[PDB]
Amino acid sequence: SGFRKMAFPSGKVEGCMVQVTCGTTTLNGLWLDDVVYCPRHVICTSEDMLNPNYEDLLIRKSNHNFLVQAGNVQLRVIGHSMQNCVLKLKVDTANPKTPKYKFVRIQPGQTFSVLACYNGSPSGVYQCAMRPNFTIKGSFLNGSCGSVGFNIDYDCVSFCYMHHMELPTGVHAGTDLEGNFYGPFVDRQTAQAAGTDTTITVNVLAWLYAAVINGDRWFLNRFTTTLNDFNLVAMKYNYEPLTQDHVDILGPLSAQTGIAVLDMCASLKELLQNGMNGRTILGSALLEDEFTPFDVVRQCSGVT
């Protein structure tokens, strides 16, 4: 029992972190096989960041200008290429620590672990959700760029995120490992509108099932609701509309607890309309949305 915001074990990802330097900028790279991936803004200077012409900035750079260091060993760069907002540096040595890996583009509302790094060295690991508006509320400082987000299925690391920037609002933006930004963001030092965010309804419901499994049941009530009635409440409280797909994904949790999904929706409806009344659920005084139904089943079953 007990429920924590649990990150994946970061060992397989720590073995992939390197330092990338170009000119006066140093950030993190991910070394998989004979390729080092890093944000393309490593090639910029303070004069460039307002509206960099990346194609032009990269033309002034040669293989020898990209200094890649993995701990104490220097990697030899034999090729460089820009793919969207990421640079791919071909190196002459395949990473002996390369795990089984995939590059995936996660969907908004899905979760992942972030291994925050500075100068190619890991500082910490935390669990994140990709917000419905494609931002992440992380913990990153200048130098953390190139830190990656990932999920692990037994021995395969699915990399889903690479950190690129902090918006003027303090929220974070980045790309998939093909350099495609999540959201409307561009890698420029400019004010950029993050769209209206909503709460990930299916995750809140999954976390309410996690609460029930772990003994916190005060919020359960004698009511039920329909998808339509619930969705009017979700609309009013800036919650993502619930669909039958979401109900279907909550099936295992519904089967384990014996509480029908629409009955849990009626609990959530009462928590939205009345608040917590100074009470807590799994140590929280607000409705948590950064656990998916998959995360709940995995944590409550002990998947390694």
Catalytically active residues are: 41, 145
- Residue 4 interacts with a copy of itself (CB under 8 A): yes or no: yes
CB under 8 Å to 117, separation ≥6 — which residues?
Answer: 17, 28, 123, 144, 146, 147
Which C-beta is closer to a copy of itself: that of 111 or that of 267? 111
Which of 8, 101, 118, 140 is in the footprint of ligand M6I by CB under 6 A? 140
Binding string, 12-41, against a copy of itself, x = CB under 8 A?
x-xx--------------------------
Q: Are 149 and 136 in contact (CB under 8 A)?
A: yes
165-224 residues near ligand M6I, rule: CB under 6 A: 165-166, 187-189
Residue 141 Cβ vs ligand M6I, minimum distance, rounded to whole Å: 5
- Parallel, antiparallel, or unpaired for β 77-83 and 86-91? antiparallel
Q: How would you class 302 by CB atoms within 10 Å of its CB: exposed for 0-12, middle for 13-18, buried for 19 or more?
A: exposed
Alpha carbons 66 and 194: distance in angstroms, whole number: 32
Binding site partner of 164, from ligand M6I, a copy of itself, none, Cβ cut-off 5-8 A by kind: ligand M6I
Site stretch for ligand M6I (CB under 6 A), options 5-13, 56-64, 135-143, 263-271: 135-143
Alpha carbons 143 and 26: distance in angstroms, whole number: 7
Alpha carbons 181 and 172: distance in angstroms, whole number: 11
Neighbours of 191 (CB within 10 A): 8
Binding string, 107-136, against a copy of itself, x = CB under 8 A?
--------xxxxx-xxxxxx----------
Binding site partner of 104, from ligand M6I, a copy of itself, none, Cβ cut-off 5-8 A by kind: none
* Interacting residues with ligand M6I (CB under 6 A): 41, 49, 140-142, 144-145, 164-166, 187-189
